[PDB]
Write an enzyme that holds these catalytic residues in place. Structure first.
Site, PDB file in Angstrom:
ATOM      1  N   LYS A   1      -3.090  42.538  42.213  1.00  0.00           N
ATOM      2  CA  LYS A   1      -3.521  42.048  44.360  1.00  0.00           C
ATOM      3  C   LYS A   1      -1.783  42.014  44.650  1.00  0.00           C
ATOM      4  O   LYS A   1      -0.286  41.214  44.467  1.00  0.00           O
ATOM      5  CB  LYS A   1      -4.102  41.378  44.340  1.00  0.00           C
ATOM      6  CG  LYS A   1      -5.133  41.210  44.575  1.00  0.00           C
ATOM      7  CD  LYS A   1      -6.303  39.831  44.791  1.00  0.00           C
ATOM      8  CE  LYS A   1      -7.542  40.126  45.136  1.00  0.00           C
ATOM      9  NZ  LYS A   1      -8.288  38.918  45.270  1.00  0.00           N
ATOM     10  N   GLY A   2      -1.564  42.707  45.891  1.00  0.00           N
ATOM     11  CA  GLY A   2      -0.464  42.628  47.146  1.00  0.00           C
ATOM     12  C   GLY A   2      -0.573  41.683  48.473  1.00  0.00           C
ATOM     13  O   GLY A   2      -1.857  41.912  48.785  1.00  0.00           O
TER      14      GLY A   2
ATOM     15  N   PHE B   1       0.354  43.010  50.598  1.00  0.00           N
ATOM     16  CA  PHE B   1       0.084  43.963  51.803  1.00  0.00           C
ATOM     17  C   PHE B   1      -1.201  45.276  51.593  1.00  0.00           C
ATOM     18  O   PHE B   1      -0.891  46.580  51.590  1.00  0.00           O
ATOM     19  CB  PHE B   1       1.418  44.972  52.131  1.00  0.00           C
ATOM     20  CG  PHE B   1       1.866  44.332  53.020  1.00  0.00           C
ATOM     21  CD1 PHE B   1       2.415  44.162  54.304  1.00  0.00           C
ATOM     22  CD2 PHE B   1       3.250  44.007  51.973  1.00  0.00           C
ATOM     23  CE1 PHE B   1       3.667  43.245  54.378  1.00  0.00           C
ATOM     24  CE2 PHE B   1       4.432  42.845  52.657  1.00  0.00           C
ATOM     25  CZ  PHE B   1       4.349  42.881  53.957  1.00  0.00           C
ATOM     26  N   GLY B   2      -1.828  45.224  50.581  1.00  0.00           N
ATOM     27  CA  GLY B   2      -2.896  45.205  49.711  1.00  0.00           C
ATOM     28  C   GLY B   2      -2.807  45.725  47.907  1.00  0.00           C
ATOM     29  O   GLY B   2      -2.132  45.746  48.296  1.00  0.00           O
TER      30      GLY B   2
ATOM     31  N   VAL C   1      -3.787  47.072  43.996  1.00  0.00           N
ATOM     32  CA  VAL C   1      -3.294  48.231  43.445  1.00  0.00           C
ATOM     33  C   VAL C   1      -4.290  48.235  42.557  1.00  0.00           C
ATOM     34  O   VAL C   1      -4.394  47.656  41.729  1.00  0.00           O
ATOM     35  CB  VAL C   1      -1.788  47.739  43.252  1.00  0.00           C
ATOM     36  CG1 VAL C   1      -1.477  49.309  42.485  1.00  0.00           C
ATOM     37  CG2 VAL C   1      -0.975  47.703  44.324  1.00  0.00           C
TER      38      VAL C   1
ATOM     39  N   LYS D   1      -2.378  51.869  45.432  1.00  0.00           N
ATOM     40  CA  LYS D   1      -2.989  50.861  46.664  1.00  0.00           C
ATOM     41  C   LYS D   1      -3.779  51.166  48.425  1.00  0.00           C
ATOM     42  O   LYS D   1      -3.874  52.005  48.653  1.00  0.00           O
ATOM     43  CB  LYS D   1      -1.627  50.873  47.037  1.00  0.00           C
ATOM     44  CG  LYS D   1      -1.193  49.397  48.006  1.00  0.00           C
ATOM     45  CD  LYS D   1       0.659  49.206  48.884  1.00  0.00           C
ATOM     46  CE  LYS D   1       1.047  47.899  48.511  1.00  0.00           C
ATOM     47  NZ  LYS D   1       0.713  46.694  48.214  1.00  0.00           N
TER      48      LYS D   1
ATOM     49  N   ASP E   1      13.360  42.816  50.163  1.00  0.00           N
ATOM     50  CA  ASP E   1      12.014  41.434  49.613  1.00  0.00           C
ATOM     51  C   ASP E   1      12.111  42.200  48.105  1.00  0.00           C
ATOM     52  O   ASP E   1      10.950  42.419  47.225  1.00  0.00           O
ATOM     53  CB  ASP E   1      11.095  41.407  50.466  1.00  0.00           C
ATOM     54  CG  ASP E   1      10.214  41.856  50.691  1.00  0.00           C
ATOM     55  OD1 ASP E   1      10.294  43.413  49.656  1.00  0.00           O
ATOM     56  OD2 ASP E   1      10.184  41.852  51.714  1.00  0.00           O
TER      57      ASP E   1
ATOM     58  N   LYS F   1      11.650  40.975  44.792  1.00  0.00           N
ATOM     59  CA  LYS F   1      10.799  39.848  43.599  1.00  0.00           C
ATOM     60  C   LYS F   1      10.759  40.397  42.143  1.00  0.00           C
ATOM     61  O   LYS F   1      10.124  41.913  42.054  1.00  0.00           O
ATOM     62  CB  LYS F   1       9.569  39.824  43.836  1.00  0.00           C
ATOM     63  CG  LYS F   1       9.555  39.318  45.824  1.00  0.00           C
ATOM     64  CD  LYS F   1       8.431  38.861  45.446  1.00  0.00           C
ATOM     65  CE  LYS F   1       7.852  39.601  47.104  1.00  0.00           C
ATOM     66  NZ  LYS F   1       7.674  40.861  47.082  1.00  0.00           N
TER      67      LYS F   1
ATOM     68  N   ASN G   1       8.240  43.004  41.271  1.00  0.00           N
ATOM     69  CA  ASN G   1       8.205  44.705  42.241  1.00  0.00           C
ATOM     70  C   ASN G   1       9.505  45.384  40.728  1.00  0.00           C
ATOM     71  O   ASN G   1       9.146  46.460  41.149  1.00  0.00           O
ATOM     72  CB  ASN G   1       8.967  44.287  43.480  1.00  0.00           C
ATOM     73  CG  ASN G   1       8.423  44.056  44.478  1.00  0.00           C
ATOM     74  OD1 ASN G   1       8.526  42.607  44.555  1.00  0.00           O
ATOM     75  ND2 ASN G   1       6.853  44.048  44.495  1.00  0.00           N
TER      76      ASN G   1
HETATM   77  N1  LIG Z   1       2.689  52.283  40.967  1.00  0.00           N
HETATM   78  C1  LIG Z   1       2.552  51.111  39.869  1.00  0.00           C
HETATM   79  N2  LIG Z   1       1.847  50.879  38.577  1.00  0.00           N
HETATM   80  C2  LIG Z   1       1.600  50.163  38.173  1.00  0.00           C
HETATM   81  N3  LIG Z   1       2.147  48.628  38.775  1.00  0.00           N
HETATM   82  C3  LIG Z   1       1.843  48.504  40.019  1.00  0.00           C
HETATM   83  C4  LIG Z   1       2.169  49.638  40.848  1.00  0.00           C
HETATM   84  N4  LIG Z   1       2.550  49.099  42.283  1.00  0.00           N
HETATM   85  C5  LIG Z   1       2.341  47.828  41.891  1.00  0.00           C
HETATM   86  N5  LIG Z   1       2.382  47.784  40.467  1.00  0.00           N
HETATM   87  C6  LIG Z   1       2.354  46.368  40.716  1.00  0.00           C
HETATM   88  O1  LIG Z   1       0.861  45.666  41.525  1.00  0.00           O
HETATM   89  C7  LIG Z   1       0.918  44.779  42.330  1.00  0.00           C
HETATM   90  C8  LIG Z   1       1.124  44.346  43.568  1.00  0.00           C
HETATM   91  O2  LIG Z   1       2.224  45.182  44.028  1.00  0.00           O
HETATM   92  P1  LIG Z   1       3.163  44.840  44.870  1.00  0.00           P
HETATM   93  O3  LIG Z   1       4.542  46.235  45.144  1.00  0.00           O
HETATM   94  O4  LIG Z   1       3.966  43.395  44.212  1.00  0.00           O
HETATM   95  O5  LIG Z   1       2.573  45.045  46.550  1.00  0.00           O
HETATM   96  P2  LIG Z   1       2.126  43.908  47.934  1.00  0.00           P
HETATM   97  O6  LIG Z   1       2.909  42.578  47.713  1.00  0.00           O
HETATM   98  O7  LIG Z   1       1.630  44.805  48.772  1.00  0.00           O
HETATM   99  N6  LIG Z   1       4.524  44.219  48.241  1.00  0.00           N
HETATM  100  P3  LIG Z   1       5.574  43.426  48.259  1.00  0.00           P
HETATM  101  O8  LIG Z   1       5.376  42.474  49.211  1.00  0.00           O
HETATM  102  O9  LIG Z   1       6.954  43.912  47.966  1.00  0.00           O
HETATM  103  O10 LIG Z   1       5.172  42.441  46.644  1.00  0.00           O
HETATM  104  C9  LIG Z   1       2.505  43.441  41.634  1.00  0.00           C
HETATM  105  O11 LIG Z   1       2.089  43.075  40.401  1.00  0.00           O
HETATM  106  C10 LIG Z   1       3.150  45.534  41.080  1.00  0.00           C
HETATM  107  O12 LIG Z   1       3.796  44.645  39.791  1.00  0.00           O
HETATM  108 MG   LIG Z   2       3.712  41.536  45.799  1.00  0.00          MG
END
Ligand SMILES: Nc1ncnc2c1ncn2[C@@H]1O[C@H](COP(=O)(O)OP(=O)(O)NP(=O)(O)O)[C@@H](O)[C@H]1O
Ligand SMILES: [Mg+2]
Length: 284
Positions: free
Chosen positions: A25-26, A28-29, A31, A46, A128, A130, A133
């Protein structure tokens, strides 16, 4: 109707995919792990709600940035079809191993640094970086999860918890809410390296307010058991005043040329000719 840029696919539908499990869960949406019904291959997808939006996407190709295959939209949602990165979170491995030896840490730090330097050359700041990421692919190379979503146009709850806040590395200037410039990325690189060597983020506290107080006001203390070159690098990257921080004058060139990284052939690194230090026990 939202402009998604050159990645946009006017023919794709959610019906095209078998969604299997929630990867994460992120802000911005969500995954999801998804299989393309027809193609028989796995993607990370995503999914973002259109109601959350107040060019929304500028995707950048690089060896250590996650690949975006295409994007599409429904009446309510946006879908971004990405490489499924399955080697695990870098800090999952860190946690399992306690800390990394310097050659191992240097490899990861160099791959991240190369992606950051490349982005800055295109006038893009990561902003950002983290732990969540920073992934490894099945081969053990770094993959960063941001794929160019314009976050400063999407609403989300950036609430911080009093104890045990989500891990992230906030530079002094970010706490001051100053405009993001490229040198925030170099602080984040320093923090990542510190944690790979020492096992915790710099300035860490269970109490988030204390941690912010530490970032701003506590001198950097670097414990023993790291080399002189590593110490000097961390001292440079974790300078609180961004104008004195390593990378402030000549950006990536200052990091690239630092003695900590003398043994990195940056050409070989970016062309993935350096066989990774660690091979995750996966392949798909
Ligand atoms: N392409 C991917 N393959 C596998 N895991 C992924 C992938 N993209 C994201 N994830 C995992 O999914 C979770 C959410 O993605 P993330 O990039 O943290 O989303 P977000 O919060 O919307 N963007 P940010 O604000 O940059 O953190 C994280 O734990 C990532 O490790
Ligand atoms: Mg995130």
């Amino acid at each position: 109707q939202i402009n998604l840029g050159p990645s946009s696919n006017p023919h794709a539908k959610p019906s095209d995919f078998h969604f299997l499990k929630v990867i994460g869960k992120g802000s911005f949406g969500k995954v999801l792990l998804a299989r393309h019904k027809a193609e028989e291959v796995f993607y990370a997808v995503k999914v973002l709600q259109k109601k959350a939006i107040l060019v929304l996407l500028k995707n950048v190709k690089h060896p250590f940035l996650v690949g975006l295959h295409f994007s599409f939209q429904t009446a309510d949602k946006l879908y971004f079809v990405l490489d499924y990165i399955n080697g695990g979170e870098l800090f999952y491995h860190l946690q399992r191993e306690r800390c990394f030896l310097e050659p191992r840490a240097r490899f990861y730090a160099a791959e991240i640094a190369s992606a950051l330097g490349y982005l800055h050359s295109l006038n893009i700041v990561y902003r950002d970086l983290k732990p969540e990421n920073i992934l490894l692919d099945s081969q053990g190379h770094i993959v960063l999860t941001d794929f160019g979503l314009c976050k400063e146009n999407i609403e989300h709850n950036s609430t911080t918890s009093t104890f045990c806040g989500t891990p992230e590395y906030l530079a002094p200037e970010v706490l001051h809410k100053q405009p993001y410039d490229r040198t925030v990325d170099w602080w984040c690189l320093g923090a990542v390296l510190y944690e790979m060597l020492y096992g915790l983020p710099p300035f860490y506290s269970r109490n988030t307010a204390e941690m912010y107080d530490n970032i701003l006001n506590k001198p950097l203390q670097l414990k023993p058991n790291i080399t002189n070159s590593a110490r000097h690098l961390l001292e440079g990257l974790l300078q609180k005043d961004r104008t004195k921080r390593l990378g402030a004058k000549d950006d990536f060139m200052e990091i690239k040329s630092h003695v900590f990284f003398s043994l990195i052939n940056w050409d070989d690194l970016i062309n993935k000719k350096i066989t990774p230090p660690f091979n995750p026990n996966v392949s798909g």
